[model samples]
Target: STPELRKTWLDSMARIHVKNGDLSEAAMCYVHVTALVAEYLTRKGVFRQGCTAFRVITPNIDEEAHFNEDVLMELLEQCADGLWKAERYELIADIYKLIIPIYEKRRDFERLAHLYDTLHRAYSKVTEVMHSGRRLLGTYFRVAFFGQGFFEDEDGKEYIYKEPKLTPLSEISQRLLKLYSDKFGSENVKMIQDSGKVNPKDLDSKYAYIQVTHVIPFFDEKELQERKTEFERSHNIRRFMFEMPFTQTGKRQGGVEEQCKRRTILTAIHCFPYVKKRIPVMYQHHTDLNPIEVAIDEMSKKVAELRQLCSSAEVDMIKLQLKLQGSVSVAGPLAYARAFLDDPDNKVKLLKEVFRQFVEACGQALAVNERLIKEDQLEYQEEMKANYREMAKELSEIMHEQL
Candidate 1:
């Protein structure tokens, strides 16, 4: 079938589905027509605006007929809106992929960046939907007999998932690291995610990671071989000693020991690709795309509440300056600004945390932008490359400031 005929028919099919309130069917037809339109632009070039005023397929025929980037973008966005309303999240991401290329052609960096972040969110939904009821921990899908606080097996029996004291660098991990090293060729792929004690994190050392680039698994072939049975008959004395609030009000509770243990737990939790395999229905709508994205939402919420509580001029200005750049970049600065002004001292650590988070976000941004420099996007690859330099410099100076 001709592109025009196919798209026109699909468009009509979409409208009929819409009229019938069958959004699922409507979104399917909508995406088909949208893909056809993008394919039309890809092959036959484009058409002038308002000439083909949407009866279906724009239906205009002329050797001189061309495409308008603006018009097609509007159509693709409409496709996305319909798909999203239908809760067809993967399809929604598919629509955006069609939308993103045009933005690249337009060099609309602002929108492109927004599009990347938004696309990530869509993929997040896709991943979450793909794994919905079970919580996957290191390839082990825990049967959520009760909930996450305890690990359960297929039989609904619960047990303590004891932490293993694996060697500093396991032989299996070392072998994998060697393979990645050969694959990366002279470039390093440090086993930092699983091994943090000697892994890179110093200002100069850390920024060497242009990207997390590759996040290979630390444990492969190792099943949950270490499960402890907690048949507790008496823990009253143990509970009193550890759980007792032994500190006075406002004093450092449990001191550095508690802080260290708590921090390790938090880090370990984040390090592993921990996520709910099956998100509970009641909590599904309440949660986000995934764990890391969930964290930024949390950071933004806290900073916003913290921003509301602000009275200091210092904080207000810092918040304003950070807002101009945005997102993780914005969240970190305002959070640190509040932390700094509310207390004082370690003006050094305050500055340290701010740059740390900003650069972390920056590196991710770089990673996203870097991939955009592909063969398909090579027409304006230099422009994207220059933008990368402009981008890398923001991180570059921030890196320099670390010294």
Candidate 2:
């Protein structure tokens, strides 16, 4: 019933917004429909049925309702309608701000997921679309730092790192700025990565002060936690205090801020152990799971949405072409596998074949990514070879496990 009702709501939304394009009317209708739907869902007593302690989680509201669908619907409709009317897009940022509190109280994590799905769907519909700077950087760090570093020069024509020795941090920063500017916006997003030099590469300089700085940016802390939980769940790897550090002297280094600094000591006591302090110490346990595979899974979902849109498209040929474009052309059957040969259900076989190909391509991508990341790590190790590798290794291991 819930599935059918949800579909009904979605179908109505498509008809009201897509076909008619009556933004004002659609917004009003959505508000009304949501209020009615919420009342029904709430009165049906679904919360208690779910295993959660309904009495504690669902507190007596100021409005005397378990959930105020009217308020939520009004906000959501404003958000959806804003997309329709160019004048209303401002409502999106406000809508997000408004809806967040309600959802947080309701423990509607699924609502956030659905919102992400909805936003992606609409955004994908735009022609020549690009991600915002914040969005791009978010993805970049998630890949470069979390998954594995970006591919190096040998793999591509226009490479990021051309001058091997001490790559221009500003240039790397510019690429990131452009990437994010294309995705989000330069004005809306500010990208900053900071590193302090304990000792100058050029000994001719007179500045002898030890420099250490920390980086900060705006992003959802909760979302980062959710990401950590996801990796832990999928990979069975407990990441205690994992931070990916990309080495760059200036802003050009395209990676997350390395929480740990690689510093060289000029004077030290022979028998005394040297202790170093880190910045922001945002640590976690890293999973052995390949980031490329995770990305492939994400793309698979996107491909499915595209397929759905193609099927439901006003023109049948347009839809068919979309599906074909998304699908991979397959070759001969697997060795010792006679299942697809005998079964009439080629659809299942086709999906499996495409999935297999996706996995294979992902594996190749991971290899490229691994090489680049391994190189970066090795370079950092060399940069700090003056420090004991054994101690560093132990610290890393402890960080990966420390709660």
Candidate 3:
């Protein structure tokens, strides 16, 4: 089983499959080639378990075992792009889910976060098609938080695609939130089609909403993955995904750098105890506000204590979310917090409801951490770091920089 021979052979087959428009066959060929190279990297002890190996591919790593990181990602990207072209929505999502860990191992959160958004589209489309019996072949709606545009409603009122306004709702979002609640009906919570996609004519305000009709029924992307997963489970497709050998949620990967990124983000943006503090001031209208606002100092102190206590905890949670293997939401709890808390236009009409959502998202993350991770794994991660250092020192090709 020479890795070189298998890779090129599979590559040739994948390209030929693509030439004939057999994207499904092409995607599988790419996956086979990816696994082969990744397992070969494993065969040399570069890293361990589940083909997410990337540590040895780094510039800092002084090792004879250098494989191009981009090549692996490109092969997988080809797989995902092919599946998307083939309209294999669920499989497209699975490929993104698989690639997420590799980026996670490299501590590339920007790429990781973007992948979640793209993963959102896949699950979003997958759910609607299933529910609509695949007849609705529609395009997913997309509006950037800061993008310029209008999202027209049923009654002919045009709503601006508002920019993010930090904690308190942006003015337009607030207006929209109130618009339907007052006159029509408050709406929020959450897609597909294709000739690829037909762009309907832009109309006057009375029928403007029809322009983006496909985006009409949107769910929180993470929320949809849960719905979609249940749909897949019930429909008897990929049933083995629920079974174990295939279902380990958060086994460790990579090194200290990955854990470092987790602790920093937790403390900086989402420290749980300080979850209440993150909600901006004007909305801080509560009887219990002082206990939280005053305690922000002492409250956030243990964020690091828990992180340094079990450094792997947050890392484990994110890993589970990306793999689409978590018991909770696929967006992961912290991400849920960001989207829910930052989104200013929902029908959550009061500060009490606002506070509740904050506490819920944070608590959910903590609870999932407890279920999936423990202090023992943290120690093992530490031990493995040293083991790599020692093993590489003898190999005379790897380097170590920090303690």
Candidate 4:
């Protein structure tokens, strides 16, 4: 009787709170009724009945503006035990939805991300593979955006702060991308994903092949058609990739070449360097440099070269000056004074010292080369004299023969 009385009071409060636009309070009242029913159902070993009760109550929960985190958390714990034990993954996943906004409002982003991850895994556990990926991808993106500091203040000014913990934004994006690809092949995913990134005016030039590829399929059999293509043809591009697949030609022709190019841009854009700023997990992996990334590297190299060139003086000139001054005793002080006066910056002065040493090394190498050249020239002269003598003897022998 007491439990029944308690239930009636909560039901009345829930209805009143819903009418007044206080949905959080309404959800709390609903939870109290559900929790009592849950205890009774658990004792009877008919846990599904209580969860069914939860499912019946929660659809209207979405109409409420916000959720009370503590009540929602308790509700999840109360439902998760039986649902998990019975392998009622879908119901447990439904519980996940109830708690998502609660964790989101607290700015407890990791929990929001974790909740979606659990939802995805739970879907994977189902006997018949449910294509629940489409729904959870939105949740993943919301958490990803939050990890990138996407949040709103009470006054609605969007405030962003660095994510305190590492969130698997890229992993979830890749997972969703794969799920989309599995449902409607990579060809379709590319056409849909790339169309958003391309400009509308150049869609004719840049993505004209996509148009040609998908054109026939747009009007083809409705069951076999990609719903994404129709949506894209009708609506403007948005952040997420649309659900349409590219049209297929089933020929070894221009479609193949076009497919290859679309994939190339897709690969580059998905590259860690390109998406690392947007997705947190991309930063953790090694990414091959895309054109833009390569450009950044080259610019850094050129900056280093220019710095070296400007700071360095001519080593040969420094060495020649030293040699003309004769002894080190006489030249060293003059060189030091000139170096200090000519270059006020320490870096330039250091470069001049490096040049001085380099010039000295070159002078030594030149001296060695000169010595070798002299020896070679002397040998050449002796060989020439010997050949001249032999020619003279031959001429004498010819003259004797003539006489």
Candidate 5:
């Protein structure tokens, strides 16, 4: 009985393995079935009466199992169809991790780079917010470029962009860097230079040019100097310098370099507008105080504010106070509706009253959020524009200011 159970499970296991694109594992299960039943049959002249056998075995493997060339390639093609249809990007990335090293060993840089590109497309589909995108960029960078150095000439001019260094980087990092660069506009790059403490505004002439040149030194001096002059001539500079730290402390132990990488990726997301804005009322609760008290106070404050808009002082204050106190018991539409349904007042009157107010409140809250986001975007864009102007001004000082 136990043997039959095992045999049935093993048969299903072989099919599941094939569905998951594990052909080798599925093949192994078939071999185990032959071994288990064939051996028993050979040893005995006939099957035991009223008895059957079943067996299961996981595939045996050498140390280099995942690196098997033919098996991996077949799995890649098979999994691609399944992965594309499912739209679970991170799972695709997980599969790529296994096969990426195989490509690396064969010195197939082209395929390795293509894998990361495909990996990024998956990342983009899943990453809806700036923070998540930054995390994905950081992960890919670590996977493809960690510990890889870009070498500079004696004058500190980097040549890796032209001809990459002989390291894990190869052309892979170049593709990743270019990918994000094109995705995030050069204007945003200029915006980053002029904002925050590490202001590189006056560090070079061209706004977008300086941002790229700092992260990547692909430009010759002649090209850089010409852009600097053009920027200064068009925009007037008001401030020469400002006080700020050269480096900020990192939250994690690895410190500034890691922080720098994160910041670089974050700036590229173009979603910093959301990150930078602070709308006090948008948050449902305050952290420093108790949540129940905060929610109660917030609701109380809103009701008081609305009452101020009342048309007449002839309104009954006593009755109004009693009604407001009663309303305070209502948490939300669902909670109030639950109480309404259970109460003796099976009146359709109460249902209409509660339903209308709840729907209106929901609409109001949605509008408030929409307006807040729009206001934040406007402010953010203005700040970004101002920074670009400041960037030009700062560049003028560095170029012509007296030593």
Candidate 6:
């Protein structure tokens, strides 16, 4: 009877062609098959109710029946408890991989919050314990495992997984940094993600050898209408932070910082526009496909093409003036006047106002780069203040070199 039932169940699962099964389907099938056996055992009064975990170590089972669900669950429960008591976050996170799907499918928001709290507690514990160790700095994940934090055991040894840190800038990471890296690399090899602190040694040796590129992660896009109000609020606050004086009330008070933080968060907030401008999510201009380098390159070409339309003004000279002015403000129709005077060749008839507006737009385009430079400098300052303490000696050498 057991063999006949197993054969029937396996056939249904093997009929995966019905849904064109993949690994995920196979995994589900394994779970379902085990559940069926558990139910059969339950009817015979062999296993207790609501305890599907026992089948994990069930004896006299076929390859398909091989599992230790109870053991796995007990280990998982212990792992979660370990994360809570010892504050080993990285290891705890590994455990989350096993259970989150269950919670997500059930839409257990409270459980999600509980899990989030667990993660936070583990992280906080690491910070507290590391501070007690008389060590100034330890990586967030390392702290929890090194001291009294609990970790998972594999073949009898405690485990802490440590994936080497990476930055978007490294050549190796460029492919994996964003969605468009691969196509961009294929079309324009020079165009790649450039963030901070690249590991060129790994990139040069491993990245090129693998030819791995164009693997962008799936992140849900926010509906524009849903976020429209939020965008406005953020935009207004962002502008106010920048438009206000450095000595504003918020600046003097602790907006950005709390008791430990020194400055108002406005400075940090103000830096967002520039930082956000560079982030691909906010601006298409910085897309992997249409990188800033390509945008400027195309802009330069446009200027050249437009110049051929008129000969009244030296196009190069006008460009220089525009750069110096830093803006072609609406104070006058200077851009239009220049274009009008220069078009003696009559090759093009353009409206002075429209031309001036175009020039002003171009000037604003250049300003984004200026903003990026300033924002990057601010990030450097924050990075130095927060993270560079470990490299004080290296920083001193850098300062000396500059001198």
- What would the TM-scores of all predictions be? 0.26, 0.20, 0.29, 0.19, 0.23, 0.21
Candidate 2 global CA lDDT score: 0.33
The pairs that clash in candidate 5 are 3-54
For candidate 3, the C-alpha RMSD (Å) to the true structure equals: 26.0
| lDDT, model 1, position 209 | 22
Error of 1 at 227 (Å): 32
RMSD after CA superposition, every candidate = 25.8, 23.0, 26.0, 27.7, 28.4, 23.8
* lDDT tens readout by residue for model 6, 1-403: 7734764665465346124422222233333344455455455664333224422222112233332445434444544653343222434564555657656776878877888788887767656654454322111010011111111221112111111222222433343323333533433223223211233333422122112212111112453343343222222121110011122233422322111111111111121111111111111111121122222333344444433323323234344334423322211223223323332333223332234334434443333323334453545334423332323233234323210
Mind giving the per-residue lDDT tens digits that candidate 3 earns over 1-403?
4667767777787778667555544655555566556666566675243243322111111121234557667776776676566455665665565678789888999987876776788878877766555522222221111111234322322121212212223343344345534543443211011101223343232221211211222234574576454333221111010001111234332221121111000001111111011111111011112212222322233233333323443354555333222212222223223333332333323322433333333344444545565675655334433443343232232111111
Which scores higher on lDDT, 5 or 6? 5
Candidate 2, residue 228: lDDT:
53
Give the residue spans of candidate 3 off by over 4 A: 50-68, 105-107, 135-403
Backbone clashes in model 3, listed as residue pairs: 62-397, 62-398, 137-193, 138-192, 138-193, 139-192, 139-193, 190-217, 190-218, 190-219
lDDT of 5 by residue, 215-266 (tens): 2211235645753632221111111111122223533223222221122211
When 2 and 5 are scored with TM-score, the better candidate is 5
> Candidates sorted by TM-score, descending order?
3, 1, 5, 6, 2, 4
lDDT of 5: 0.34
Model 4, residue 117: displacement in angstroms? 2.0
Off by over 4 Å in 4: 1-71, 127-403
Best by TM-score: 3
Superior candidate under lDDT, 2 versus 5: 5
How far residue 28's Cα lies from its native spot in candidate 6, in Å, is 16
lDDT of each: 0.38, 0.33, 0.38, 0.36, 0.34, 0.33
TM-score, cand. 5: 0.23
